[PDB]
Design a binder for these strands. Structure first.
Length: 849
DNA sequence: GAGCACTGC
C-alpha cells in the first residue's frame, strides 16, 4: 500500500461540518412513491391488464370521420393533382403487389417485406394500408407507425410521402424524432419515427395499444433498437391479437427475420437501380497497370485464387496480387492513380472514395491537393475534392452535394458515413478500399479498442449501389475476389458490441425483470457475462438493490433518455445547484463534441480547446465554457464569426442546448427542480464553484479513475485504477499539459489505438472521490491513519476528518434515498440544505488559490 | 500526438 496526499481538513471546518450535519439530523405529498410501490407489487399478468385499461383510446372510432374521409378520398382521386402522381406511384414495384400485401396483412399478424433500393416499400406500404382502411370506411381505426434508424430519413421520407399525397406535413403524414416533430392528425395517419422514439413510448404504452399497424424498417442493419423491438414483439404480440406488424428488410440475410417470427410470409419486391459493374483488384490493375513500391496468411489466400484465374489475367497483373499492400488502402498513391485513371478515361461523373478513417482521408487529400507526381499536378486543378468525415464540416455545408464547376470532376474521400448516413446523388464512380474502423470490446481485459478491419459483403453491396442512383456506375473494389470470399456476410450485430446497463434498466419499466431470460431470446443473444457486467454496474450506482430489484433512484434513471451514470450526475446537479454546467457535460458525452477537426487545422483546433478549457483541466467543463461563449455570440449577433474562429458546429451546439433543455424539463416534471429552465438562477447557485463541479462530474464518471505520477508538451506516467498505464488522448484537453493541481482524473471512455488512451477527462480531488464514491474506509497502515476510496487509493487522513467524512457519507446516502423516493427541490433554508452546505464547505478547501 | 457510424415521449 502506497499512501497519497493528506486529506485532513482544518478543525474550524470540521466543527462547522458537524454543526451542519446535526442540524440536518434534527429533521422530522408523494405520488412517486406510490407509483414505485405499485410497479413492484404487480405481476406481469396484472401489468398487462392495467395497461390495457389505461391505453383504451383506439377502442373508440368516429363513424362520421370514417364516412367523410372515405368520401373525400374517392372525390380527390378524380382531381388533377393526384392521378398524375398515382400513375407515377404505380411505376414503383411495390404498387404492383398492393393487393397481395393487403390480403397478407389481413390474414397474418406479422409479415416480412424484402426489397432493395428503389422498390418503394418505405414510401408505398404505409400508404397502401392507410388508403385501404379509408376505402373500407374504417379510417379512424387506422394509426400507422413506421420506424426508421436515422433522424434525417424519418424527416425526408415523411416530407416525400406528404408531397405524394398533395399535403403539407402534419395531416395524414407526420414524423417524430427526439425533440422535433411534425405530428400527423391523430387517426387515419402515418407517422415516421426513429426506432428509439417508439422504444421510449413503450414506457407509457408497453403493449402498444396506441397504434394499429407497426412497420419496422431496415431491420437487416441489426441496430440495438430494432433487434430489441423484435424481441419485445414476442412478448407483446400474444397479448395484442388485433395489432399488425410489417417487418421490412433489404436483401441481407433476410431469411433470419422470417425464421425469427415463426415462418411468417415473405414478399420479395424487385428494385429500381441502374447497373453498376463490379471490378475487383485484378480488374483494376489490369486497367491501370499501376506499379508498386516505396502475416502470410495472405499467401495461403491468394495463391489458390491466382491458380483459378491464371488464364483470365496477365501473369504480371496476378503477381501484384501477391503483394499484401496491393489490397485495401495500404498504398495511397495506388488509389490516387486510380482516381487519375478515372479522370482521364470514363464519362463525366463524381468519384466517391471509401477509406477507413481520418488519417487515410488526410493522406489521400494531400496527395491530390499537393501532388508530387506530374500526372497528379496535371489533374489537381481539374478536381473538386471533398473529404467527408463525421468530425469535418464538409457534410454540414452544401458544396459536396452540388455538381462541381464545369471542367472539374468531383472527388469525395469518405469514411463509411457515405455508405448510408450521407448521400451524394451525382456519384457515378465508387472506389471501395474494403477497409473501415470498428470498436471492439474485450470482456476479459475490459479494454475497448478501435481497429482497422475489412468491411463485410453487405457493406460492399451497399457501396456498389451508391454508384447507381443517376446513371450506370462502376464500383472499383481494391481487393481480390479471394479476399471477398473471406469477408463476413454482415457486421457483428451491434447488440453484441454494446454496454448493457441502459437496456437492462429500461426493461424494468416494461416489467421484464430478468434480463438473462429476455436477452437470450433476441436474434443474437448477448454474452451473459456482459449482462452480469451490466447488472453489477447498476447495483454499484444503486439503480438496483443487491437482489437486482429496481430502486426509486433506478426508476428515475430509466425515465431519462441518457445512460444511467450520466443520468445520476444530472440528478445530482439538481440537488447541488450546478444544473447548467453538468447538463452541458452530460449532453456532450451522450451526443458528441461540438468541435470540428478540419484537415491541416489540428494544432489550431488544439489551441482553441485550450483556450475554452480556461486552465480548468477538464474536457467536460471545456464543453460548457464553449456553450457559454456560444450563447454570448448569439447575444452579440456574432454567431457565425464565433463558430468560424473556433471550429465549432452551430448545429451541434444547438442540439446540445435542446438536450440540456430536455433534461431540465424532465427534472422539473419529476419535481426535482422548481424551474424547467436549465439556466434558472435557483438551479445554478453553485455553478461557478469549480471544485463542486469536479465533484459532481466525478460522481457521474466514477468509478473510472486515473492517477498521474509524472513530470516533464510533457510526457505522462499515468495508470487507471486497475493498474494499466494510460495517456490522455491527444484530442483531450489534458494531453501534454503539466502542473496539474491534482494527480487524479475521472474519464468517460478509455480506448486502445496506438496506446491506451483516455478520450476525455476531468481532474478531480481526492476528498470529492471519497465523499461521492465507495470502498471508503478509515484505518492505520504503517503507523499513519488513512482514508481510502474504492479500496484502491489510500490517502493520509487524521481520525478527526475520517470520522466526520464517514458520518457525512452516511447522511448523504440517507438524503439521496429520500430525495429519490420523495422528489422535491431542496429548499434554500431547510434541513436538507444544511447537509448540502456541509459538503460544499469540505469541497471548497481544494479551490485554486 | 490522434478521432468507423447511428440514437432517446
Amino acid at each position: 500500500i502506497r499512501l497519497g496526499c493528506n486529506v485532513s481538513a482544518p478543525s474550524g471546518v470540521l466543527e462547522r461540518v458537524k454543526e451542519l450535519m446535526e442540524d440536518y439530523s434534527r429533521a422530522p405529498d408523494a405520488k412517486f412513491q406510490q407509483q414505485f410501490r405499485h410497479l413492484l407489487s404487480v405481476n406481469f399478468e396484472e401489468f398487462v391488464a392495467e395497461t390495457k385499461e389505461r391505453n383504451a383510446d383506439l377502442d373508440w372510432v368516429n363513424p362520421k370521420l370514417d364516412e367523410r374521409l372515405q368520401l373525400e378520398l374517392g372525390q380527390r382521386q378524380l382531381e388533377e393533382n393526384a392521378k398524375k402522381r398515382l400513375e407515377a406511384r404505380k411505376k414503383l414495384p411495390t404498387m404492383k403487389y398492393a393487393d397481395d400485401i393487403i390480403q397478407a396483412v389481413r390474414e397474418n399478424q406479422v409479415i416480412l417485406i424484402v426489397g432493395s433500393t428503389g422498390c418503394g416499400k418505405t414510401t408505398q406500404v404505409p400508404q397502401i394500408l392507410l388508403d385501404d382502411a379509408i376505402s373500407r370506411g374504417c379510417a379512424s381505426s387506422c394509426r400507422i407507425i413506421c420506424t426508421q434508424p436515422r433522424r434525417i430519413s424519418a424527416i425526408a421520407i415523411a416530407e416525400w410521402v406528404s408531397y405524394e399525397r398533395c399535403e403539407s406535413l402534419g395531416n395524414s403524414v407526420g414524423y417524430q424524432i427526439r425533440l422535433e416533430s411534425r405530428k400527423a392528425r391523430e387517426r387515419a395517419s402515418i407517422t415516421y419515427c426513429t426506432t428509439g422514439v417508439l422504444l421510449q413510448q413503450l414506457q407509457s404504452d408497453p403493449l402498444m395499444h396506441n397504434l394499429s399497424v407497426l412497420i419496422l424498417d431496415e431491420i437487416h442493419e441489426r441496430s440495438v433498437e430494432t433487434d430489441l423491438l423484435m424481441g419485445l414483439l414476442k412478448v407483446i404480440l400474444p397479448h395484442r391479437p388485433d395489432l399488425k406488424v410489417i417487418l421490412m428488410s433489404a436483401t441481407v440475410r433476410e431469411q433470419d427475420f422470417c425464421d425469427y417470427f415463426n415462418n411468417c410470409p415473405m414478399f420479395r419486391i424487385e428494385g429500381v437501380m441502374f447497373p453498376v459493374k463490379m471490378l475487383y483488384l485484378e480488374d483494376v490493375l489490369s486497367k491501370t497497370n499501376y506499379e508498386f513500391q516505396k502475416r502470410m496468411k495472405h499467401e495461403a489466400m491468394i495463391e489458390p485464387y491466382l491458380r483459378r484465374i491464371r488464364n483470365s489475367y496477365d501473369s504480371r497483373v496476378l503477381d501484384k496480387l501477391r503483394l499484401p499492400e496491393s489490397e485495401g488502402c495500404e498504398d495511397i498513391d495506388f488509389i490516387a492513380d486510380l482516381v487519375y485513371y478515372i479522370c482521364e478515361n470514363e464519362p463525366e461523373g463524381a468519384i466517391l472514395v471509401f477509406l477507413p478513417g481520418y488519417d487515410k482521408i488526410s493522406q489521400l487529400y494531400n496527395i491530390l491537393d499537393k501532388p508530387k507526381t506530374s500526372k497528379g499536378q496535371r489533374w489537381r486543378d481539374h478536381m473538386a475534392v471533398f473529404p467527408l468525415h463525421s468530425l469535418m464540416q464538409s457534410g454540414e455545408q452544401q458544396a459536396v452535394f452540388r455538381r462541381p464547376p464545369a471542367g472539374q470532376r468531383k472527388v469525395i474521400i469518405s469514411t463509411i458515413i457515405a455508405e448510408t448516413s450521407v448521400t451524394i446523388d451525382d456519384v457515378v464512380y465508387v472506389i471501395n478500399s474494403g477497409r473501415t474502423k470498428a470498436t471492439n470490446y474485450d470482456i476479459e481485459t475490459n479494454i475497448q479498442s478501435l481497429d482497422e478491419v475489412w468491411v463485410t459483403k453487405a457493406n460492399t453491396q451497399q457501396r456498389r449501389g451508391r454508384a447507381g442512383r443517376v446513371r450506370p456506375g462502376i464500383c472499383y473494389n481494391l481487393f481480390s475476389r479471394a479476399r471477398e470470399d473471406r469477408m463476413d456476410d454482415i457486421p457483428t450485430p451491434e447488440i453484441l458490441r454494446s454496454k448493457l446497463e441502459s437496456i437492462i434498466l429500461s426493461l424494468k419499466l416494461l416489467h421484464i425483470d430478468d434480463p438473462y431470460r429476455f436477452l437470450q431470446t433476441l436474434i443474437n443473444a448477448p454474452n451473459p457475462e456482459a449482462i452480469k457486467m451490466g447488472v453489477e454496474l447498476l447495483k454499484r450506482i444503486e439503480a438496483l438493490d443487491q437482489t437486482g430489484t429496481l430502486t426509486p433512484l433506478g426508476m428515475h434513471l430509466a425515465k431519462l433518455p441518457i445512460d444511467p451514470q450520466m443520468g445520476k450526475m444530472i440528478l445530482m446537479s439538481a440537488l447541488f445547484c450546478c444544473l447548467d454546467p453538468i447538463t452541458s457535460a452530460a449532453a456532450a458525452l451522450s451526443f458528441k463534441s461540438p468541435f470540428y477537426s478540419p484537415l491541416g487545422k489540428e494544432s489550431r483546433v488544439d489551441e482553441i480547446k485550450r483556450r475554452m478549457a480556461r486552465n480548468m483541466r477538464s474536457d467536460h467543463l471545456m464543453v460548457h465554457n464553449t456553450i457559454i461563449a456560444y450563447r454570448d455570440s448569439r447575444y452579440s449577433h456574432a454567431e457565425r464569426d464565433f463558430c468560424y474562429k473556433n471550429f465549432l458546429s452551430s448545429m451541434t451546439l444547438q442540439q446540445l442546448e435542446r438536450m440540456k433543455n430536455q433534461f431540465s424539463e424532465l427534472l422539473y416534471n419529476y419535481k426535482f427542480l422548481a424551474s424547467s429552465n436549465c439556466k434558472d438562477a435557483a438551479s445554478n447557485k453553485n455553478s461557478e464553484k469549480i471544485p463542486l463541479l469536479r465533484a459532481i462530474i466525478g460522481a457521474g464518471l466514477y468509478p473510472n479513475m486515473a492517477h498521474l505520477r509524472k513530470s516533464r508538451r510533457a510526457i505522462h506516467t499515468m495508470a487507471t485504477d486497475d493498474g494499466r498505464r494510460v495517456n490522455f488522448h491527444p484530442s483531450s484537453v489534458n494531453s501534454g499539459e503539466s502542473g496539474f493541481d491534482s494527480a487524479y482524473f475521472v474519464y468517460f471512455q478509455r480506448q486502445k489505438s496506438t496506446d491506451l488512451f483516455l478520450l476525455d477527462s476531468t481532474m478531480v480531488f481526492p476528498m470529492a472521490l471519497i465523499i461521492f464514491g465507495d470502498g471508503v474506509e478509515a484505518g492505520v497502515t504503517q503507523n499513519t491513519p488513512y482514508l481510502c476510496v474504492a479500496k484502491t487509493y489510500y490517502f493520509k487522513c487524521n481520525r478527526e476528518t475520517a470520522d466526520v467524512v464517514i458520518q457525512l457519507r452516511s447522511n448523504l446516502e440517507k438524503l439521496l434515498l429520500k430525495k429519490a423516493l420523495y422528489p422535491a427541490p431542496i429548499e434554500e433554508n431547510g434541513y436538507e440544505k444544511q447537509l448540502i452546505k456541509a459538503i460544499e464547505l469540505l469541497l471548497s478547501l481544494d479551490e485554486r488559490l
